[PDB]
Write a protein that holds these residues in place. Structure first.
Motif, PDB file in Angstrom:
ATOM      1  N   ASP A   1       1.749  -3.459   8.244  1.00  0.00           N
ATOM      2  CA  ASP A   1       1.335  -4.331   7.169  1.00  0.00           C
ATOM      3  C   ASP A   1       1.841  -3.741   5.848  1.00  0.00           C
ATOM      4  OD1 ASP A   1      -0.052  -6.413   5.879  1.00  0.00           O
ATOM      5  OD2 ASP A   1      -1.780  -5.068   5.555  1.00  0.00           O
ATOM      6  N   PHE A   2       1.691  -4.463   4.742  1.00  0.00           N
ATOM      7  CA  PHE A   2       2.151  -3.953   3.452  1.00  0.00           C
ATOM      8  C   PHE A   2       1.115  -4.169   2.356  1.00  0.00           C
ATOM      9  CE2 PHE A   2       4.122  -4.169  -0.695  1.00  0.00           C
ATOM     10  CZ  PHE A   2       4.899  -3.022  -0.710  1.00  0.00           C
ATOM     11  N   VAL A   3       0.924  -3.165   1.510  1.00  0.00           N
ATOM     12  CA  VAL A   3      -0.050  -3.252   0.423  1.00  0.00           C
ATOM     13  C   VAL A   3       0.421  -2.534  -0.832  1.00  0.00           C
ATOM     14  CG1 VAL A   3      -2.429  -2.782  -0.240  1.00  0.00           C
ATOM     15  CG2 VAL A   3      -1.935  -3.352   2.090  1.00  0.00           C
ATOM     16  N   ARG A   4       0.174  -3.145  -1.981  1.00  0.00           N
ATOM     17  CA  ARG A   4       0.551  -2.558  -3.256  1.00  0.00           C
ATOM     18  C   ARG A   4      -0.696  -1.882  -3.837  1.00  0.00           C
ATOM     19  NH1 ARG A   4       3.723  -2.800  -7.398  1.00  0.00           N
ATOM     20  NH2 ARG A   4       5.807  -3.767  -7.466  1.00  0.00           N
ATOM     21  N   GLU A   5      -0.561  -0.609  -4.211  1.00  0.00           N
ATOM     22  CA  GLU A   5      -1.663   0.166  -4.791  1.00  0.00           C
ATOM     23  C   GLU A   5      -1.174   0.776  -6.092  1.00  0.00           C
ATOM     24  OE1 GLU A   5      -4.000   2.807  -2.415  1.00  0.00           O
ATOM     25  OE2 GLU A   5      -3.394   1.813  -0.545  1.00  0.00           O
ATOM     26  N   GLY A   6      -1.390   0.058  -7.190  1.00  0.00           N
ATOM     27  CA  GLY A   6      -0.897   0.517  -8.477  1.00  0.00           C
ATOM     28  C   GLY A   6       0.611   0.492  -8.359  1.00  0.00           C
ATOM     29  N   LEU A   7       1.264   1.599  -8.687  1.00  0.00           N
ATOM     30  CA  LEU A   7       2.725   1.664  -8.590  1.00  0.00           C
ATOM     31  C   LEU A   7       3.206   1.967  -7.168  1.00  0.00           C
ATOM     32  CD1 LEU A   7       3.200   3.590 -11.891  1.00  0.00           C
ATOM     33  CD2 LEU A   7       4.298   1.376 -11.425  1.00  0.00           C
ATOM     34  N   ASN A   8       2.281   2.274  -6.273  1.00  0.00           N
ATOM     35  CA  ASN A   8       2.661   2.562  -4.899  1.00  0.00           C
ATOM     36  C   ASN A   8       2.779   1.258  -4.098  1.00  0.00           C
ATOM     37  OD1 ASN A   8       0.948   5.791  -4.377  1.00  0.00           O
ATOM     38  ND2 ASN A   8       2.938   5.275  -5.259  1.00  0.00           N
ATOM     39  N   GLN A   9       3.880   1.128  -3.382  1.00  0.00           N
ATOM     40  CA  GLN A   9       4.152  -0.027  -2.523  1.00  0.00           C
ATOM     41  C   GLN A   9       4.083   0.688  -1.199  1.00  0.00           C
ATOM     42  OE1 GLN A   9       7.702  -2.160  -4.205  1.00  0.00           O
ATOM     43  NE2 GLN A   9       7.429  -0.600  -5.801  1.00  0.00           N
ATOM     44  N   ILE A  10       3.065   0.398  -0.410  1.00  0.00           N
ATOM     45  CA  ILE A  10       2.923   1.253   0.796  1.00  0.00           C
ATOM     46  C   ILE A  10       2.811   0.452   2.082  1.00  0.00           C
ATOM     47  CG2 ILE A  10       0.850   2.273  -0.486  1.00  0.00           C
ATOM     48  CD1 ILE A  10       1.337   3.419   2.804  1.00  0.00           C
ATOM     49  N   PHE A  11       3.591   0.822   3.079  1.00  0.00           N
ATOM     50  CA  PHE A  11       3.549   0.206   4.409  1.00  0.00           C
ATOM     51  C   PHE A  11       2.453   0.950   5.120  1.00  0.00           C
ATOM     52  CE2 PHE A  11       6.925  -2.796   4.855  1.00  0.00           C
ATOM     53  CZ  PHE A  11       7.942  -2.421   4.065  1.00  0.00           C
ATOM     54  N   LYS A  12       1.663   0.184   5.773  1.00  0.00           N
ATOM     55  CA  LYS A  12       0.575   0.590   6.491  1.00  0.00           C
ATOM     56  C   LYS A  12       0.738   0.287   8.024  1.00  0.00           C
ATOM     57  CE  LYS A  12      -3.433   1.760   3.618  1.00  0.00           C
ATOM     58  NZ  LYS A  12      -3.367   2.919   2.405  1.00  0.00           N
ATOM     59  N   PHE A  13       0.265   1.261   8.817  1.00  0.00           N
ATOM     60  CA  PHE A  13       0.400   1.126  10.248  1.00  0.00           C
ATOM     61  C   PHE A  13      -0.934   1.072  10.992  1.00  0.00           C
ATOM     62  CE2 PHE A  13       4.772   1.753   9.572  1.00  0.00           C
ATOM     63  CZ  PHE A  13       4.751   2.482   8.471  1.00  0.00           C
ATOM     64  N   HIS A  14      -1.246  -0.059  11.668  1.00  0.00           N
ATOM     65  CA  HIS A  14      -2.466  -0.141  12.474  1.00  0.00           C
ATOM     66  C   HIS A  14      -2.111   0.065  13.904  1.00  0.00           C
ATOM     67  CE1 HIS A  14      -3.885  -1.149   8.483  1.00  0.00           C
ATOM     68  NE2 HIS A  14      -3.513  -2.418   8.535  1.00  0.00           N
ATOM     69  N   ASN A  15      -2.468   1.238  14.467  1.00  0.00           N
ATOM     70  CA  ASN A  15      -2.091   1.434  15.813  1.00  0.00           C
ATOM     71  C   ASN A  15      -3.361   1.346  16.729  1.00  0.00           C
ATOM     72  OD1 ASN A  15      -1.689   2.859  18.120  1.00  0.00           O
ATOM     73  ND2 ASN A  15      -0.243   4.359  17.324  1.00  0.00           N
ATOM     74  N   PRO A  16      -3.356   0.538  17.823  1.00  0.00           N
ATOM     75  CA  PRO A  16      -4.617   0.188  18.624  1.00  0.00           C
ATOM     76  C   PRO A  16      -5.171   1.496  19.241  1.00  0.00           C
ATOM     77  CG  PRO A  16      -2.555  -0.551  19.821  1.00  0.00           C
ATOM     78  CD  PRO A  16      -2.129   0.026  18.460  1.00  0.00           C
ATOM     79  N   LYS A  17      -4.301   2.468  19.480  1.00  0.00           N
ATOM     80  CA  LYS A  17      -4.682   3.808  19.827  1.00  0.00           C
ATOM     81  C   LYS A  17      -4.935   4.776  18.560  1.00  0.00           C
ATOM     82  CE  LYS A  17      -0.837   3.627  23.704  1.00  0.00           C
ATOM     83  NZ  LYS A  17       0.341   2.795  23.358  1.00  0.00           N
ATOM     84  N   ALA A  18      -5.573   4.349  17.493  1.00  0.00           N
ATOM     85  CA  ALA A  18      -5.756   5.318  16.442  1.00  0.00           C
ATOM     86  C   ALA A  18      -7.096   5.993  16.847  1.00  0.00           C
ATOM     87  CB  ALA A  18      -5.906   4.608  15.203  1.00  0.00           C
ATOM     88  N   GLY A  74       5.039   5.035   1.643  1.00  0.00           N
ATOM     89  CA  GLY A  74       5.448   4.366   0.399  1.00  0.00           C
ATOM     90  C   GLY A  74       6.936   4.232   0.358  1.00  0.00           C
ATOM     91  N   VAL A  75       7.391   3.119  -0.265  1.00  0.00           N
ATOM     92  CA  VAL A  75       8.791   2.795  -0.660  1.00  0.00           C
ATOM     93  C   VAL A  75       9.077   1.906  -1.999  1.00  0.00           C
ATOM     94  CG1 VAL A  75       9.365   2.441   1.656  1.00  0.00           C
ATOM     95  CG2 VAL A  75       8.633   0.476   0.282  1.00  0.00           C
TER      96      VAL A  75
END
Lengths: 114, 102
Positions: B85-102, A113-114
């Motif tokens: 990627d980026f997604v807004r969840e309520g007041l949280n603005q959160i960067f999301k990471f899709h790694n092919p090795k997850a 988050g940021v």
């Protein structure tokens, strides 16, 4: 199964309280934040903190240090006792949720988050 | 023959979703002197974003829509190919990471 059930309630850490007071303060008509829960995963369930102005009839109110935290009854079951915290550090800003009943706290550190 | 060096490796590189690109541009615009963000890992591990003013020598750069994302070499063998990627969840603005090795 629905309510009229006496819950322990929920909490805000001082840090979460200061931040909520600060978003109130830049933002008119904002009364507080509201925790809901959303369907996700297999039979999973995500938290969702949102700015609120007009509480629903059904909400409960948990007030710490002037900050309001409204929580819907159709949610209390799945999340009674959670403490809402907020961590700010350099570029990281986030609201975090600690459910006491949960054990299995997330590992998938696949967010920032940021 | 068989002898190499991962500092000279050809990487798949990281990508930025259009939503992550604009929020990076937005984070950068708010701070005079900042030119982009640096993706790193910490600590059963996690991604962290850092502000970049003067990029490091051993840092790779991935640009997309004017958004600069820096990744250190030491992390490439581990998060190469990763999508931010980026997604807004309520007041949280959160960067999301899709790694092919997850």
């Amino acid at each position: 199964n629905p309510q009229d059930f006496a819950w322990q309630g929920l909490t805000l850490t001082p840090a979460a309280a200061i931040h909520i007071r600060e978003l109130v303060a830049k933002q008119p008509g904002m009364v507080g934040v509201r925790l809901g829960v959303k369907q996700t995963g297999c039979a999973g369930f995500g938290y969702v903190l949102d700015s609120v102005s007009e509480p629903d009839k059904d909400d409960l109110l948990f007030e710490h240090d002037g900050a309001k935290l409204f929580v819907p009854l159709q949610a209390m079951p799945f999340i009674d006792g959670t403490e809402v915290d907020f961590v700010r550090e350099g570029l990281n800003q986030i609201f975090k949720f600690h459910n006491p009943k949960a054990q299995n706290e997330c590992g998938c550190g696949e967010s920032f988050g940021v």
